[PDB]
Ligand binder design. Sequence first.
Ligand code: HEM
Ligand code: HEM
Ligand SMILES: N=C(NCCC[C@H](N)C(=O)O)N[N+](=O)[O-]
Ligand SMILES: N=C(NCCC[C@H](N)C(=O)O)N[N+](=O)[O-]
Ligand SMILES: [Zn+2]
Lengths: 414, 416
Amino acid sequence: KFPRVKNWELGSITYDTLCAQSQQDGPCTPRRCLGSLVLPRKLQTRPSPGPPPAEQLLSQARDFINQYYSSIKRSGSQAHEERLQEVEAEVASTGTYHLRESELVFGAKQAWRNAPRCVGRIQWGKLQVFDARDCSSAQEMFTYICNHIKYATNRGNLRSAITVFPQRAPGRGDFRIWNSQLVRYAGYRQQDGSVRGDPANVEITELCIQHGWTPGNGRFDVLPLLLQAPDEAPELFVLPPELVLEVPLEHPTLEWFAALGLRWYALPAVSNMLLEIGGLEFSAAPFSGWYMSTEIGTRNLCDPHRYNILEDVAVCMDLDTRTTSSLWKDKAAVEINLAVLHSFQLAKVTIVDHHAATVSFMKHLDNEQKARGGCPADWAWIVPPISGSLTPVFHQEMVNYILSPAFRYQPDPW
Amino acid sequence: GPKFPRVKNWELGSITYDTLCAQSQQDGPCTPRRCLGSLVLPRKLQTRPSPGPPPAEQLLSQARDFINQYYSSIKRSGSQAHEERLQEVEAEVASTGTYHLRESELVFGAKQAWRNAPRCVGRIQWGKLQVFDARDCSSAQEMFTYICNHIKYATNRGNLRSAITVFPQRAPGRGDFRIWNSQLVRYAGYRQQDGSVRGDPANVEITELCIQHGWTPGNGRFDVLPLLLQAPDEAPELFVLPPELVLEVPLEHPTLEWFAALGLRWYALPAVSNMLLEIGGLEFSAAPFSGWYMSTEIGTRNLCDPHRYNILEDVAVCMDLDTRTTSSLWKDKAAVEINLAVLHSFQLAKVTIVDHHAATVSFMKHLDNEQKARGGCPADWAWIVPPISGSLTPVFHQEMVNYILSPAFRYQPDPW
Ligand code: HEM
Ligand code: HEM
Ligand SMILES: N=C(NCCC[C@H](N)C(=O)O)N[N+](=O)[O-]
Ligand SMILES: N=C(NCCC[C@H](N)C(=O)O)N[N+](=O)[O-]
Ligand SMILES: [Zn+2]
C-alpha cells in the first residue's frame, strides 16, 4: 500500500501516501522494473484526430477543477459548483473544453511540481506564465518565442518562464516547435561520419538546411527555429544574435583553457515536450529556468556522443591518458565543470552547481512531505552525472509515479 | 515489435530486447502505479525467518525448477537421469519434508546466484568462482576453521581469487547456522561520550554485540572486528582472526606526499557474510563469498559517505581548497585524489583491485555476452553506475531491466 521511504545518511523514515493519487501507469510491474528507461514504449501521447472519450476527459477535468478550487481555499464554494457545471456543459456539447487563464497558471506550476526528473523544483512556485493560446501562425509563434527569450534571459539574471501555445484539437494538426530546445548548436555530418558541432543535433540541423537554411561551418553555430502551425509545413526563423546570450569558457588558473575556443548558451529551454492539464493537451509549451552546471560541463561537453572533449583537455593538462587507473578522465571532467561555473559567474549569468542544487531539492522533499504526503522523484535523473554519492540525494530513497498536471514526451512532428 | 522490454544504449544508439525476465518466478516491489526501484530493502525478497517447515507443494515446485535448470546447463534436459533426479527429490521431500543437493548442483547453483545478482558490476567473472562445500560443518569452532581457510585461499597474498563457502542449509524446526557479522572483515565502530563514533559508524551494533559477548574492545579507527559464529540452537561464539591472515593496505598518494601521514588504510578482501543463498527452495543461511574490490567502494563510499568515515573535509583542507563554498568543487577534487590514492596504494602493494573505468567497461562486455547466452541480464542501474564520474563510464548510458531470478542471494533478518 503505502511505501516506507528511508534516507540512509540520516536514518529518517517517511511514508508516501501521495502515490495513491496517481491515475496513470508507469512502465514497471511486479515482474520487472523498467525505471531506468528514458522514453516510454506506450505511455506516449498518441494522435488527436478524434475526440477524447467524454467520460475519461470529464473525470480528468472534474479532478483538475477540484484541485484548482482547493488551492484557492474555495472548495465547495458557489464558484466551484458553477465552474464544474460549465465544464460538464462544454464537454457534453463539444467533446472538449477550455481553461481560464488562472487555471492554466495553476496547472503549469503544478506540472513542474509533479515532474519526477527535475531537481530544481524548489522553485516551482515562481514561474512566469505567458498565455499564447491567442496564436494563429508560425510568424506569431516566433514573436512569442523571441519575447520569451528576452524576458527569461534578462541580461544574465535568468527568470523561469513558460509560454503556452494553443491546445490540441480533434482531427486538426498540432502547433509544434520542431527544435528540441529554443537554442541549440548545429551538428554538421562531415568526412568519415565524424561531426563538427553538436552530434545530438544532426537531424534537426539537416532539416533546417532542407528547408532553406544557409549552414555555417563552425563548432558552435546557433540553429534557426522551425515553427509549425496546424496542418502547415514548418517555417524557418533566425534568432536575432543579440537575443542569444552566450558564455565564452575559460579556466580560473589554466591559462590555455580559453585557447580551446569553447562556449555555451545561457538559456536552457526544452521546447518539444507536451503539457497536460485536466485532460487538455498543449503540444507547444517551451519552458526555461537556468542551468545546473553538470548539464554543460559534464553531459554536453564530455558525453562520448556529444562534444567529447575529455581527451583534448587531458592532453593539454598533460595527464597520463595511457591507462584508466590514472583517473585522467575524472581529473579533466572536474576542471571542465570548474571552468563552466567560473565562466558563467564571470559573465554574470545565472547558474547553479550540483551540490547547491541537490541540497535545495532535499529541502523541497521535506516541504512536499508536509504539504502533500510525498513527492514523485526519479533517482537516476535527480542524482548528478559526476560525484553522485558526494551529494545528499544519492542517499535518499525515492518513489516514482505519475501525477497530473504533467509534462510528457511526444512524437517528433516529422 | 517484440513483446518484451526494449532496452537502449544512448552512447552507441543500439537496441536489445530482454526476454530473460520472462523467466522470473518472484515479484519485485514495483507496480504499474509506482516504481520502488530505488529502495535498498523493499519488503520483497527479504528472507524473513520462516521457522515451521515450508509447504511441500511450494518447495517441490521450486526444487523442480532448479533441477530443470541444472539439467539444462549440462545439456541433458528430458534425459533419464533428469527424470530420475526429479523423482528422487520428490520422494525425499515426501518422506522427510526437505531434500539435499548433489555436489555439482551446489557448484552450479552458487555460480548462478552470482550471475543472477542485479547489483553486482563484477559479474564478468561469474564463471570462475571457487565453491567450498562446508555442508558437513557441525560446530561454531569448525565454522571458524572453514572461514580462515576461505580467507587464506581468497587472499592468496595479494593475487585475490573469487570464492564462496557454503555451510549447512536450514532444517525443519531447527536452529540455523549463522554468521552474525555483515562481512568476514570489518572495522570496529566505537560509540563516544559526546555521541560521535571512532572507527566505522556502520558497525556500531555488531561491535557492541561482540563486547556483550566477551570481546575486549580496542580504541583505534581501524580495529578488525572478531567473528560471532552461531551453530544450531546455541548462543553465538566469539573468534578472533589471526592478524597475519587479514591483509590490509596502508594508503598513500602518488604525488601528494602528505597523504600517507593521514594514517588511512583498508582491508584487501571484501567478504559479505550475512546474505542468504537460496537454491531450489533450500536456504543456506550461512554462505560467505568474496572476490576483489572496485576502487570506488573504498575510496568513495566507505571513506567519503557522510555516515561512514566521512573524510572529504579533512583531505580538502590538506589540499588547501575552499571548503566554504560549493562552487569551488572541493568535494569533487578531494574525492578524485582519494580514489587515486586507493588505486595507487593497492597497485604498490600488489593487491588486486579494479578502477571504476575498467570495471564498467568489463560489465558492458558481460552484458553483451549475456545478451547472447540468456537474452538479457538483470541489473540495478543505481548500483551498477559508480558513485563518482557516473556519466564518464559506459554503463551510465545503458538502460537496464531489473528482476529477480533464482538461484539468488537475498537479505535475511539479523539473528539477534
Ligand atoms: C530554475 C531552474 C531549473 C533547474 C536548475 C532545473 C534543472 C533540471 C535538471 C538538471 C534536469 C535534468 C536534465 C537532463 O538530465 O537532461 C531537469 C529536467 C526537467 N525539468 Fe527542470 N530545472 C529548472 C527549471 C525547470 C522549469 C522552469 C520547468 C518547467 C516549467 C522544468 C521542468 C523540467 C522537466 C519537465 C524536466 C524533464 C525533461 C526531460 O525529460 O528531458 N525545470 N531540470
Ligand atoms: C570479482 C570481483 C567482484 C567485484 C569487483 C564486485 C563488485 C561489486 C560491487 C561494486 C557491488 C556493489 C557494492 C555496494 O554498493 O555495496 C557488488 C555487489 C554484490 N556482489 Fe559483486 N563483485 C565481485 C565479486 C562478487 C562475488 C564473488 C560474489 C558472489 C559469488 C558477488 C556477489 C554480489 C552481491 C550479491 C552483491 C549485492 C550485495 C548487496 O546487496 O549489498 N560479487 N559487487
Ligand atoms: N535546467 C534545465 N534543463 C533542461 C534540460 C537541458 C539539457 N540537459 C541541456 O541542454 O544540457 N531546465 N530549465 O531550467 O528549465
Ligand atoms: N566487491 C564486492 N563488494 C560487495 C560489497 C562490499 C562493500 N561495498 C564494501 O565493503 O565496500 N564483493 N566481492 O568482491 O565479493
Ligand atoms: Zn521500477
